[PDB]
């Protein structure tokens, strides 16, 4: 993760702002509609458009990512609680992290076009791959 990558990611996520929760929930919906295998992780959740649970869960993902854009230099210690929750408890297949990362990128391209340049696209992809490595690093 280059200095320019950090510069691009902080800028791209800076233009997200209050729309964070809206973006996280859109990316989750994009994931559930495009990749049905991902739905099985949420049987208790109502997964219809504009459901309270997906809207609420979207904010959490977005805020965790905001925490990650802040603690970019020391991400493994920052997301430690999540790393154990996803791997040890929820048992999330690493494949599904790729699926959410792409859907997060699709949400960013659809909402921030002027900001979604090839260079920023790369940095954002590199960063989401870093988050995903950190959240799948605690497998026993």
């Amino acid at each position: 993760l280059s200095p320019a990558d950090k510069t691009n990611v902080k800028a791209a996520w800076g233009k997200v702002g209050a729309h964070a929760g809206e973006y996280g929930a859109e990316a989750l919906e994009r994931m559930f509609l495009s990749f049905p295998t991902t739905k099985t992780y949420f049987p208790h959740f109502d997964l219809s458009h504009g459901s309270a649970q997906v809207k609420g869960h979207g904010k959490k993902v977005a805020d965790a990512l905001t925490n990650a854009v802040a603690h970019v230099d020391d991400m493994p210690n920052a997301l430690s609680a999540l790393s154990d929750l996803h791997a040890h408890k929820l048992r999330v297949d690493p494949v599904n992290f790729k699926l959410l990362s792409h859907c997060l990128l699709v949400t960013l391209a659809a909402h921030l076009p002027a900001e979604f340049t090839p260079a920023v696209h790369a940095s954002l992809d590199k960063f989401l791959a870093s988050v995903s490595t950190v959240l799948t690093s605690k497998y026993r």
């Binding site: 994009r30 509609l33 495009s34 990749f35 090839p118």
Partner: protein, 145 residues
């Protein structure tokens, strides 16, 4: 298996696609985001920076060919395996492209369509296109099986 309603929205969005630039934008981004893919395009010249990749005439020219083949697939959804049969033989036996990169170019194309159409590229329109790009990658990987 595309439902008739998502089969309609796909063609409706594709009709608004600029056949001269979208292909080159997807190929260009592939080489920037996944730099190992440049190993197959060393005869293309300058690919040192995003700007050179995106401004490469050969990348735009080859992108147009790649996009043209995506259009043939959309026109033949019930015969994707057959549509990409010689391209599969080419990519696998002559070009030695690992089939994982077909999945990546598909997702980069979905990212390009999201970038161009914005709010028009809704979650159910993306889901329909994921069926298409998955179908093409699988049709292109067929000579490997």
């Amino acid at each position: 298996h595309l439902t008739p309603e998502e089969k309609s929205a796909v063609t409706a969005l594709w009709g608004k696609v600029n056949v001269d630039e979208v292909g080159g934008e997807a190929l260009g981004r592939l080489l920037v985001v996944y730099p190992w893919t440049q190993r197959f395009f060393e005869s293309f010249g300058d690919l040192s920076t995003p700007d050179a990749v995106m401004g490469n005439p050969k990348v735009k020219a080859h992108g147009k060919k790649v996009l043209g083949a995506f259009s043939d697939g959309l026109a033949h959804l019930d015969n994707l395996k057959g549509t990409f049969a010689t391209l599969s033989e080419l990519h696998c036996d002559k070009l030695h492209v690992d089939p994982e990169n077909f999945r990546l170019l598909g997702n980069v194309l979905v990212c390009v369509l999201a970038h161009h159409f914005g709010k028009e590229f809704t979650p159910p329109v993306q889901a329909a296109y994921q069926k298409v790009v998955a179908g093409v990658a699988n049709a292109l990987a067929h000579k490997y099986h």
